[PDB]
Paper text:
Here, using a pseudotype virus entry assay, we found that [name] and its close relative, PDF-2180, can efficiently bind to and use specific bat [name] 2 ([name]) orthologues and, less favourably, human [name] as entry receptors through their receptor-binding domains (RBDs) on the spike (S) proteins. We determined the cryo-electron microscopy (cryo-EM) structures of the PDF-2180 spike trimer as well as of the [name] and PDF-2180 RBDs bound to [name] [name], revealing a binding mode that is distinct from that observed for SARS-[name]-2 and NL63. Our structural analysis indicates that [name] and PDF-2180 bind to an apical side surface of [name], which is largely different from the surface engaged by other [name]-using coronaviruses.
We determined the structures of these two complexes at a resolution of 3.8 Å, and C2 symmetry expansion was performed for the [name] [name]–Bat37ACE2 complex to further improve the resolution to 3.5 Å, enabling a reliable analysis of the interactions involved in binding. The [name] RBM inserts into an apical depression constructed by the α9 and α10 helices and a loop connecting α10 and β4 of Bat37ACE2 through a network of electrostatic and hydrophobic interactions involving the tip of the RBM four-stranded β-sheet. Moreover, the methyl groups of the [name] RBM Ala509 and Thr510 residue side chains are packed into a hydrophobic pocket formed by residues Phe308, Trp328 and Leu333 of Bat37ACE2. Moreover, the [name] [name] glycans at positions Asn54 and Asn329 sandwich the strands (β8–β9), forming extensive interactions with [name] residue Trp540 and to a lesser extent with Asn532, Leu539, Ala541, Gly545, Gly546 and Val547 from the [name] [name], underpinning virus–receptor associations. As expected, the mutations N511Y and R550N in the [name] [name], which abolish the polar contacts and introduce steric clashes, resulted in a significant decrease in [name] binding and viral entry. Moreover, the Bat37ACE2 N54A mutation (abolishing the N-glycosylation) and [name] W540G/N532G substitutions (eliminating interactions with the glycan) hindered binding.
Author numbering:
A (entry chain A): 21 to 621, 634 to 712
B (entry chain B): 386 to 479, 481 to 573
The structure:
Amino acid sequence: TTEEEARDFLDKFNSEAENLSHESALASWDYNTNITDENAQKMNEADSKWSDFYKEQSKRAQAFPLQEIQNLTIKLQLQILQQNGSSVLTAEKSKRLSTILTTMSTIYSTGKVCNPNNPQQCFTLSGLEDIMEKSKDYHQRLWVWEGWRSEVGKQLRPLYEEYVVLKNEMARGNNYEDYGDYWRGDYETEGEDGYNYSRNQLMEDVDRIFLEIKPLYEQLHAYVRAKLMNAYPSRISPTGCLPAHLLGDMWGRFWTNLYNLTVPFEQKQNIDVTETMKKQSWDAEKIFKEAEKFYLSVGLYSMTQGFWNNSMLTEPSDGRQVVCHPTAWDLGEDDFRIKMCTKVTMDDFLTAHHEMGHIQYDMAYAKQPYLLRNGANEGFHEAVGEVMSLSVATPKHLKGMGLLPSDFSEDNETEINFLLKQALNIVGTLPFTYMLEKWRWMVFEGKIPKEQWMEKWWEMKREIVGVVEPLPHDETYCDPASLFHVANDYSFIRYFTRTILEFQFQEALCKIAKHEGPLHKCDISNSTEAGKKLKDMLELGKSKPWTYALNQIARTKEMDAKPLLNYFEPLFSWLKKQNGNSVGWSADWSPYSEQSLKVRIWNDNEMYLFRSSVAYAMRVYFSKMNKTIPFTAEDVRVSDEKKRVSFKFFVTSPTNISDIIPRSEVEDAIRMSRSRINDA
Amino acid sequence: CNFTELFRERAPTIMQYKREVFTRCNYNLSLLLSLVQVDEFVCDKATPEALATGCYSSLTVDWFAFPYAWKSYLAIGSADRIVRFNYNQDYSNPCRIHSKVNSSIGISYAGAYSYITNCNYGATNKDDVVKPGGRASQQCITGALNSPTTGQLWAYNFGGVPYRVSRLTYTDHLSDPLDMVYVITVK
Ligand SMILES: *[C@@H]1O[C@H](CO)[C@@H](O[C@@H]2O[C@H](CO)[C@@H](O[C@@H]3O[C@H](CO[C@H]4O[C@H](CO)[C@@H](O)[C@H](O)[C@@H]4O)[C@@H](O)[C@H](O[C@H]4O[C@H](CO)[C@@H](O)[C@H](O)[C@@H]4O)[C@@H]3O)[C@H](O)[C@H]2NC(C)=O)[C@H](O)[C@H]1NC(C)=O
Ligand SMILES: *[C@@H]1O[C@H](CO[C@@H]2O[C@@H](C)[C@@H](O)[C@@H](O)[C@@H]2O)[C@@H](O[C@@H]2O[C@H](CO)[C@@H](O)[C@H](O)[C@H]2NC(C)=O)[C@H](O)[C@H]1NC(C)=O
Ligand SMILES: *[C@@H]1O[C@H](CO)[C@@H](O[C@@H]2O[C@H](CO)[C@@H](O)[C@H](O)[C@H]2NC(C)=O)[C@H](O)[C@H]1NC(C)=O
Ligand SMILES: *[C@@H]1O[C@H](CO)[C@@H](O[C@@H]2O[C@H](CO)[C@@H](O)[C@H](O)[C@H]2NC(C)=O)[C@H](O)[C@H]1NC(C)=O
Ligand SMILES: *[C@@H]1O[C@H](CO)[C@@H](O)[C@H](O)[C@H]1NC(C)=O
Ligand SMILES: *[C@@H]1O[C@H](CO)[C@@H](O)[C@H](O)[C@H]1NC(C)=O
Ligand SMILES: *[C@@H]1O[C@H](CO)[C@@H](O)[C@H](O)[C@H]1NC(C)=O
Ligand SMILES: *[C@@H]1O[C@H](CO)[C@@H](O)[C@H](O)[C@H]1NC(C)=O
Ligand SMILES: *[C@@H]1O[C@H](CO)[C@@H](O)[C@H](O)[C@H]1NC(C)=O
């Protein structure tokens, strides 16, 4: 009778779960729509009611063991509700872990980096990123990058090391090996026949996928490097890794901002129609109503009246404060809304479709039981939205729609500029996500000793991504926590998978629509057959294995970069011609190693005295001239070392940082000052 | 004609302004301007003298109470909240009169005289602008009538359509010889 009582329990849960979800989701909507302390309170109270409900239900859920449940939807709903999570931790550890998590978030969030030479000018994280995206000054970019690592990274280090242990203990209490599996378990599912996927091959799939897209990334790397070398002359070698601070961002996760230095055909204009949309008198509603027309011509769902009446499609000028970050909302009771501040721009034209597409998916699985009302997994949600966005980005759509001139034609130079920009967005970030989780998993698993965390971080990064540290680091730093997602406990691998699924879905849909030619030129408008296949899959929600959902639309139960490589095939060939045999990179070189000296052997105090003597020697060398530089032991930088065997070093000016004094100059500075280096 | 209502105890607000159409009458403008004083006579495509001479097919007069200091907010070309969400003037037919009415003429000054400051609606935050010669919609007024005098923007639901309205008073800016605005258009 376990099956029967489990059924009644879940039906009861699902009914009130939907009613409470509505109250909480609506209060949150109203707060963000109209910002004020009164609404913040209503939101917080509604969320507190939800948590008390969910928590009490998760206690009763333990009375319905999975062992005697033969129904797949009862089994899945109980698995979702029954998880203990942080609750198997004792009160001391639960409280400490929450405190650590909150502290890590705070250090990242309000971290600041000041100008080392002119310290009245200091920037917050958003100020630093603006500088980091726009400046072309090697020096400025370096103190921003390096500053963040010492101001934020080192303060996070002592928290991460306790954090890793507590997260692993939590995972063990949930029957996992460590926290790696706790996260990897989000892909685990047990169906019938071949629809059975282990959390333990996620590692197998990402390594396989990574290797197949390696050739494309290597071609992109060589091209970007060759072009970037003319922006930062004699800072970047012909063959090797790129300096981290020159990648166009604080973390180097996207090569999006290097595009302006790397454009294939710089004199040619790209395609957009912002001027045309203004000329044709477009506005918010038109933009969203056109997006609906698109979803209807594909064959999916039209929008409800509540959307047109209840949403926020434009930025208000009423006096109300709002947050304009675009989000698709599902408030329950089939109430679907979009909150966005739309204006007549290409960016909002395409974003409006992205948010609309999330709703189309939200509607499809609305029919599912409350706990199963989500996509097949973390990656499917965005992967679908991206495909539906690519469908309208293409000029094929824009021309057919009557926005582009009918004399508009697609050049084979414009094709290259487009594909590269996409590659810098996709191909360039795939290795970042892959490397981060590769390392992160090893850290939680326990394969990398605490004392080797930074050593493996940078060694592994040069091997996989091809990025090298401008300056060497000790184990006092923890650059991984420098990123939001690490500091705030978020899974990152979803960024890898959504991309791979995106192209698997797009290619299958194009074939269904009977598209001929390159995939980047594919359109699914006026293709009901492609529409119908997509709908069948979206409607599944979480009721079936994600490999089942993948099999229906892409005809396989595994992820492949097969379709990604085809999307970018014309770019791969173009890059090959441009790169020749410069393809790939070495991980032997670093920006500071060329001018380094080697010391053969040792206490930390002896290293200090050595550095002090080197700084002295540099002072003497310059003192003979009419230039005085206040070198101290701190200005002597030490490279990766082998304890009691050897180490390497270089010295920089205390007032520049970016400079390295040439080996030869340092070497005879030391020889000149060979005498009087004794003690006692 | 019959102008005993123009100079009556009830002095209408901007949110809910009053008007009359006068037909089959022998106009007597020279008395209207003798009964009450006029500070300003501002009129396009017509003159003070022209309106006093000759008969016309129809005379229309609109009026409301309104402080002199705010006279620029009724100006043509103005994008003020007063003109946009309440009283747009008809410029398709040729006169704004600023007239102080003596307390000896039974005109009162009572109630929280007000105008609409904002009236958006739908997911477009689209504004509900009054057409020239028209009046603020019933939905804008109904919401505004239940708003605080401090101008807070409050949400209302009228027939399934959401509205965000606010109201602001000018009940304090009065004098015994209260300043009123009359608008005359002549066909
Ligand atoms: C942005 O967010 C704020 C905060 O939530 C909203 O402010 C509330 O707005 C609602 C209207 O949407 C107000 O509700 C109304 O209250 C009136 C009484 O006000 C007095 O008493 C309250 C305490 O209850 C005091 O806070 C207030 O200052 C006054 O002293 C009622 O008379 C209204 O009644 C109407 O609706 C009922 C519905 O049942 C009908 O039966 C009535 O006949 C009548 O039509 C109404 O209940 C609420 O009081 C406001 N909160 C606060 C703290 O002032 C903003 O409106 C919101 N803005 C937007 C654009 O979203
Ligand atoms: C905004 O909504 C109104 C009506 O909302 C519906 O009816 C209400 C009474 C309530 O039950 C709501 O939750 C419902 O969503 C729309 O007005 C309707 O428009 C259609 C034309 O498409 C017309 O045939 C109906 O008769 C109208 N209904 C009413 C009550 O007037 C209005 O169109 C929506 N706004 C937009 C932009 O779609
Ligand atoms: C959540 O934690 C509870 C303990 O608080 C687990 O319940 C115990 O399970 C063991 C092993 O079967 C039993 O021997 C204990 O008697 C149970 N204790 C209680 C109070 O029931 C529960 O299994 C955990 N749930 C999940 C999904 O991990
Ligand atoms: C890439 O180059 C474009 C120019 O083609 C830059 O766009 C300009 O951005 C500034 C703001 O910093 C605007 O004031 C200009 O009007 C924009 N120019 C044009 C023609 O629109 C873009 O910012 C550059 N991107 C990066 C990362 O440097
Ligand atoms: C599983 O339960 C659902 C109700 O939640 C029911 O519709 C479905 O038919 C059941 N399937 C089997 C095999 O019992
Ligand atoms: C889809 O077909 C319609 C005609 O029903 C046409 O107006 C529209 O432009 C077509 N869409 C595209 C992208 O060609
Ligand atoms: C575009 O086509 C022309 C031939 O018409 C060719 O010479 C040129 O190299 C091609 N460019 C690219 C980027 O494919
Ligand atoms: C650092 O040295 C370089 C020379 O390589 C010079 O161009 C730059 O202006 C110097 N910056 C500072 C802050 O001294
Ligand atoms: C209003 O009263 C004053 C006396 O205070 C008088 O001088 C003035 O003429 C009166 N105005 C009118 C229009 O009668």
